[PDB]
């Protein structure tokens, strides 16, 4: 019978990603791939086996074309006519961390495994992170 990973016997590593001009979508797909764990031979769809990801610059991210002044982010509050929108340029100045999180959130399963994988993503808008004890290793150099 084929081997299946066990959550009690899983190995997970810490990585740090520097987004200082990286394309939003081409960075988010690598982050989501490494969060789901498609880079390991022992990948299982039913249990999570992935590596923690740390983003240190959530405001230097780059979007190509005229999407800086476009690409509205819609969402509804629940009340009638509660539709609200904000563009990339205004959102990246207000909440830089939520710009890149929503891209990865829409690129994971919509099951409770997706929520667990999303909790391993930890973005920061500054230049340093509070995970020096974990000692993440640089990748994508």
């Amino acid at each position: 019978k084929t081997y299946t990973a066990k959550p009690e016997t899983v190995q997970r590593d810490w990585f740090v990603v520097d987004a200082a001009g990286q394309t939003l979508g081409r960075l988010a797909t690598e982050i989501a791939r490494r969060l789901r764990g498609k880079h390991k031979p022992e990948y299982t769809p039913h249990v999570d086996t992935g590596d923690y990801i740390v983003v240190i610059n959530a405001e230097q991210v780059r979007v190509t074309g005229a999407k800086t002044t476009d690409k509205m982010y819609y969402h509804h509050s629940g009340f009638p006519g509660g539709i609200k929108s904000i563009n990339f340029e205004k959102l990246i100045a207000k909440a830089p961390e939520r710009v890149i999180e929503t891209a990865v959130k829409g690129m994971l399963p919509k099951n409770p495994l997706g929520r667990d994988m999303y909790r391993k993503l930890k973005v920061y808008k500054g230049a340093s992170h509070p995970h020096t004890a974990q000692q993440p290793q640089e990748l994508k150099i």
């Binding site: 084929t2 081997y3 390991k40 031979p41 022992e42 990948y43």
Partner: protein
């Protein structure tokens, strides 16, 4: 699942699944996906010894 595991094991060695199967088919190694995903996880040395020969096949 076996295809996904073999692709993950091969990308760590420096190939892709589409090129790996072609390299295997340039010769006739004839190892199934069930017994390539098992070697990808447990027998990593044997999987690497298969992948290097697939690279040597130049395909």
């Amino acid at each position: 699942l076996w295809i996904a595991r073999i692709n993950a094991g091969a990308r760590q060695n420096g190939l892709s699944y589409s090129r790996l199967i072609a390299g295997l088919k340039k010769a006739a190694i004839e190892i199934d996906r069930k017994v390539l995903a098992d070697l990808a996880v447990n027998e990593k040395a044997a999987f690497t010894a298969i992948v290097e020969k697939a690279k040597a096949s130049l395909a």
